[PDB]
Design an enzyme around this catalytic site. Structure first.
Site, short mmCIF file in Angstrom:
data_model
loop_
_atom_site.label_atom_id
_atom_site.label_comp_id
_atom_site.label_asym_id
_atom_site.label_seq_id
_atom_site.Cartn_x
_atom_site.Cartn_y
_atom_site.Cartn_z
CB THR A 16 -9.73 -34.22 47.37
OG1 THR A 16 -8.76 -35.09 47.66
CG2 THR A 16 -10.87 -34.98 47.70
CG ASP A 39 -20.77 -30.55 18.80
OD1 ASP A 39 -20.14 -30.20 17.90
OD2 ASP A 39 -20.68 -29.89 20.04
CG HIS A 69 -16.66 -28.82 18.57
ND1 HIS A 69 -15.93 -27.92 19.15
CD2 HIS A 69 -17.85 -28.87 19.06
CE1 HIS A 69 -16.79 -27.59 20.15
NE2 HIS A 69 -17.99 -27.90 19.88
CG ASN A 161 -15.18 -20.97 24.59
OD1 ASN A 161 -15.26 -21.44 25.61
ND2 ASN A 161 -15.40 -21.50 23.50
N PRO A 175 -31.49 -20.11 33.20
CG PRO A 175 -32.77 -18.48 34.44
CD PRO A 175 -32.68 -19.22 33.02
CB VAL A 177 -29.95 -25.82 31.03
CG1 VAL A 177 -31.33 -26.05 30.43
CG2 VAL A 177 -29.35 -24.37 30.56
CG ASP A 200 -25.94 -23.69 36.99
OD1 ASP A 200 -26.69 -23.31 37.79
OD2 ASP A 200 -26.13 -23.53 35.64
CB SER A 224 -16.48 -26.89 23.28
OG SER A 224 -17.44 -25.96 22.52
CG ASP A 260 -10.66 -26.60 46.25
OD1 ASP A 260 -10.02 -26.08 47.16
OD2 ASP A 260 -11.37 -27.54 46.12
#
Length: 279
Positions: A16, A39, A69, A161, A175, A177, A200, A224, A260
């Site tokens: 939290t 990937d 990666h 990024n 929208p 995913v 999201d 990523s 937050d």
């Protein structure tokens, strides 16, 4: 369960508050679920994977991760030390070459591959796909990610990024995913993270320690890195029976730490992935 001196991102996802270093999670740990990491591949021989990782597909002369990666992202999903869901099965699908690049036709083929390939895998708790990749808007790339999701796979994708609105990037802008922005250890939006209405959720993305190729480890940054925290969280929550592939992105948003994060632009969600685990 408690893992002390955990990477900060793991500690953040079960807390939290920022600034703690122990990751707390149900011992079930995503057992019985699967996560595809689409990937540059996965170094399955890394001791960190404990035999739970395997390559299932490549579009290039080898299924080896010659970049790092894909291995790093898989390690955040499911490695014993650096992973969210420490008992999930990891499947690598190498759509990106060892320079980290891939043509959209190959990326699409990889997404459609996973939608079928899950039917050849044992994942009784559910299936996740993590896509730490993206480029400019493509209706075809978005359509592929939408079919993968529709087929019963929780699809988590990097917002990108560019410190820009993610509406202009794919599959970020699809929208249906789960589009994942990046945060840092001080609960700031990561400086490179895309934002916008299509996001999201946020997950840890700045200075993330995970596996690398040659049996090594490395800290790197990106949306990523945030995406596989969400992917691993979804697998962990599906094994707990808390959500399903169709509902996991909503469920993560419903249960996120709210309001937050700092430097979140007006109109972008202020929601940080959180496992709501009470030890």
């Amino acid at each position: 369960a408690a893992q002390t001196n955990a990477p900060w991102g793991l500690a953040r996802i079960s807390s939290t508050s920022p600034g703690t270093s122990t990751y707390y999670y149900d011992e079930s740990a995503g057992q019985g679920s699967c996560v595809y990491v689409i990937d540059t591949g996965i170094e399955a021989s890394h001791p960190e994977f404990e035999g739970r990782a395997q390559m299932v597909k490549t579009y290039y002369y080898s299924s080896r991760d010659g970049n790092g990666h894909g291995t790093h992202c898989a390690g955040t999903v499911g490695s014993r030390t650096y992973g969210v869901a420490k008992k999930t099965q990891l499947f690598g699908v190498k759509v990106l070459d060892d320079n980290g690049s891939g043509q959209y036709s190959t990326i699409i083929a990889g997404m459609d591959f996973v939608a079928s390939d899950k039917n050849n895998r044992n994942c009784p708790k559910g299936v996740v796909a993590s896509l730490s990749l993206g480029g400019g808007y493509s209706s075809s790339v978005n359509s592929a990610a939408a079919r993968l999701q529709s087929s019963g796979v929780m699809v988590a994708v990097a917002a990108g990024n560019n410190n820009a609105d993610a509406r202009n990037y794919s599959p970020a802008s699809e929208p249906s995913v789960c589009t994942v922005g990046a945060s840092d250890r001080y609960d700031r939006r990561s400086s490179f993270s895309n934002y916008g209405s299509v996001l999201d959720i946020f997950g840890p993305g700045t200075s993330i320690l995970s596996t690398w190729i040659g049996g090594s480890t490395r800290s790197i940054s990106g949306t990523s890195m945030a995406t596989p925290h969400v992917a691993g969280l979804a697998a962990y929550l599906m094994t707990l029976g808390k959500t399903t592939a169709a509902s996991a992105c909503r469920y993560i948003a419903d249960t996120a730490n709210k309001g937050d994060l700092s430097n979140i632009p007006f109109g972008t969600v202020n929601l940080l992935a959180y496992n709501n685990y009470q030890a």
